[PDB]
Structure 1
Amino acid sequence: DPLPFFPPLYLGGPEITTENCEREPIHIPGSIQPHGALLTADGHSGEVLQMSLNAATFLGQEPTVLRGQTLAALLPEQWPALQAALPPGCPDALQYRATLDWPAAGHLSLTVHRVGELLILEFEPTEPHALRNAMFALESAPNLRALAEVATQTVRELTGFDRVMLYKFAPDATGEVIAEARREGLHAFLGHRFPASDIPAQARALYTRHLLRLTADTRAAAVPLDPVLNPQTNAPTPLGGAVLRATSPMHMQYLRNMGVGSSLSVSVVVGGQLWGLIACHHQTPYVLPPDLRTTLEYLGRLLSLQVQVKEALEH
């Protein structure tokens, strides 16, 4: 039965069980994963409102100094570019990316998107023809099976992940692994099917708009935003669109129990519906840098197109 979200934990909401699963507000956890930092800022003035508690250590500045400046002063070269790329009223799915040379922290990748009157800024550390070669190989795959196999093998070669699967949703939202590339010694998930509740209906809705989520370390504690609520609204900060967003503790338990230290998946979206996932596992924690993740994002789109094409060749 579909039911509306509970309030999050920090607003006195209940703790989540196998029973009320589908009502966790996974988009507003009030916290981020510790391998990057996040700031929120007023979309018109550029006043800095919220920051992750670890921000001082990524950005090399005291909180009170950060919060006491506008983005115009903090990001003089990027602030006008942000404002042109992310105009008021734009969708929350639109992202702008730049690379910064920050004194204390080396090269940072900056990813920005806009939710209403809020700008959300994510900072992460950042670092030949493999993509072009893959694009052509995908297109020349003769059928859906060969496409799925080429796609899994390519992603594994690009990333070094221990396991890369192509998980396909059935009409009842039960899923099935239809191809996989895996490290020697791992047991096969190929052909196994998993119940629909493994990915509850509110996650699948989110996965249709924001096409990549990840869990870099399934044992890492989440880092709170400070303050936790958006001071504009005294309400929760929407983090659906932020890759740094904390993963559900239900899903992190489900991962640790499998022996997985790192998770990542890309949505494959066909005709406006979530067709399936490029899901990846690593046994140890593992951070895939932003520019490599971009390659996977591009492959997500290519695969969406090629899945349509291969399936049309099939009636």
Structure 2
Amino acid sequence: PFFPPLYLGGPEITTENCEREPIHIPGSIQPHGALLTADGHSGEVLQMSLNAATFLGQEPTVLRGQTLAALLPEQWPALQAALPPGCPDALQYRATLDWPAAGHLSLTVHRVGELLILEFEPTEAPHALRNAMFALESAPNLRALAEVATQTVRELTGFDRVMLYKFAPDATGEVIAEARREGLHAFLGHRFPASDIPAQARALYTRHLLRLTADTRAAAVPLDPVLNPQTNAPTPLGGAVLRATSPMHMQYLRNMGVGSSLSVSVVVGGQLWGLIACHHQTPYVLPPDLRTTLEYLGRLLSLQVQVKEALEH
């Protein structure tokens, strides 16, 4: 099973119970964005991140009464149609708001049962993706495909280290390709225990294909209330990229000297084949539109891995 989260007086997480930390329900988010939850029917704002006032520019109480209808007039009917009752928690809808306080915000919404989860992040506003797609497809074998993928991602993102991280049948990990800035340790060829990414984290990565720690030293921002009014239970946040990252993992990142981290799941035959894994030495908020490019690349790599593995077997 899982332990209760901390804020419901569950045990603190150690190396004896890695598998049981409830990473989906941390009750908090990373501070480079803001999150609101809301009722599926009424559009009634039920929870907000204590930092919402910053991003939205709204007097705190104003929000926690109001309706999405009021708050987002153009958007609220689109949401209603895009995310019908009963849809999967994996389905997401995005829009760009030109919002008074903040030039442009990206809005990302998904639905978990009766709750809409809304994420707001700063945003903005060429051929590198098309060029990359053809490059991946003409790679002659899996090894070269891995090399092209890591190089392409590094060029698109500027990340200090990009790795292709392949799982063995027992969930032992192996770095099979790597693109990195001069003057970093090489992780190419190295193998790591299964417990470095515990079973409960791997299952959630099979369904929700991208996550990130924008700053491995930033404090999480609580949800208020912490419990969902609807259920008097924790809000599931696994489908939210703003989710506060496990402290266990943040400690691992810090011990490696990483300041920003991000990964993309490569899913083949319904299973987690590997990850595109990105390190930055310093804090780094990759903007939403560039993340989208990596999300596309994730799908394309999933296709090409199967194609390429089929021409060996």
Using the size of structure 1 for normalisation, the TM-score is 0.99
In structure 2, C-alpha distance between the alignment counterparts of 1:249 and 1:203, rounded to whole Å = 13
Deviations along 1:34-59, one digit per CA (max 9) or x if unpaired, are 00000000000100000000000100
Deviations along 1:82-108, one digit per CA (max 9) or x if unpaired, are 000000000000000000011011100
Deviations along 1:261-310, one digit per CA (max 9) or x if unpaired, are 00000000000000000000000000000000000000000000000000
Task: Report the Cα offset of residue 62 of structure 1.
Answer: 1.3
In structure 1, C-alpha distance between the alignment counterparts of 2:185 and 2:13, rounded to whole Å = 31
In structure 2, C-alpha distance between the alignment counterparts of 1:142 and 1:64, rounded to whole Å = 59
In structure 2, C-alpha distance between the alignment counterparts of 1:113 and 1:283, rounded to whole Å = 31
Match of 1:129 in 2: 127
Match of 1:102 in 2: 99
In structure 2, C-alpha distance between the alignment counterparts of 1:280 and 1:19, rounded to whole Å = 27
Deviations along 1:178-214, one digit per CA (max 9) or x if unpaired, are 0000000111100000000000000000000000000
Match of 1:25 in 2: 22
In structure 2, C-alpha distance between the alignment counterparts of 1:279 and 1:31, rounded to whole Å = 23
Task: Report the Cα offset of residue 67 of structure 1.
Answer: 1.3
User: Which of 52, 55, 72 matches 2:52?
Assistant: 55
Q: Look up the SS of the partner of 2:230 in the other structure.
A: coil
In structure 1, C-alpha distance between the alignment counterparts of 2:184 and 2:253, rounded to whole Å = 15
In structure 2, C-alpha distance between the alignment counterparts of 1:87 and 1:62, rounded to whole Å = 31
Task: Report the Cα offset of residue 15 of structure 1.
Answer: 0.3
Deviations along 1:16-37, one digit per CA (max 9) or x if unpaired, are 0000110000000000000000
Task: Report the Cα offset of residue 126 of structure 1.
Answer: 0.3
Unaligned runs of 5+ in 2: none
Unaligned runs of 5+ in 1: none
Deviations along 1:210-257, one digit per CA (max 9) or x if unpaired, are 000000000000000000000000000000000000000000000000
Match of 1:46 in 2: 43
Match of 1:84 in 2: 81
Match of 2:2 in 1: 5
Using the size of structure 2 for normalisation, the TM-score is 0.99
In structure 1, C-alpha distance between the alignment counterparts of 2:183 and 2:32, rounded to whole Å = 29
Task: Report the Cα offset of residue 175 of structure 1.
Answer: 0.2
In structure 2, C-alpha distance between the alignment counterparts of 1:169 and 1:62, rounded to whole Å = 48
Deviations along 1:148-177, one digit per CA (max 9) or x if unpaired, are 000000000000000000000000000000
In structure 2, C-alpha distance between the alignment counterparts of 1:202 and 1:303, rounded to whole Å = 24
Task: Report the Cα offset of residue 63 of structure 1.
Answer: 1.8
Q: Look up the SS of the partner of 1:25 in the other structure.
A: coil
Moved over 2 A (4+): none
Alignment of 1:121-200 (within 5 A): 121-127=118-124, 128-200=126-198
In structure 1, C-alpha distance between the alignment counterparts of 2:218 and 2:290, rounded to whole Å = 22
Q: Look up the SS of the partner of 1:34 in the other structure.
A: coil
In structure 2, C-alpha distance between the alignment counterparts of 1:242 and 1:230, rounded to whole Å = 15
In structure 2, C-alpha distance between the alignment counterparts of 1:63 and 1:269, rounded to whole Å = 41
Task: Report the Cα offset of residue 68 of structure 1.
Answer: 1.7
RMSD (Å), alpha carbons: 0.4
The number of equivalent residue pairs is 312
In structure 2, C-alpha distance between the alignment counterparts of 1:187 and 1:220, rounded to whole Å = 25
Q: Look up the SS of the partner of 1:239 in the other structure.
A: coil
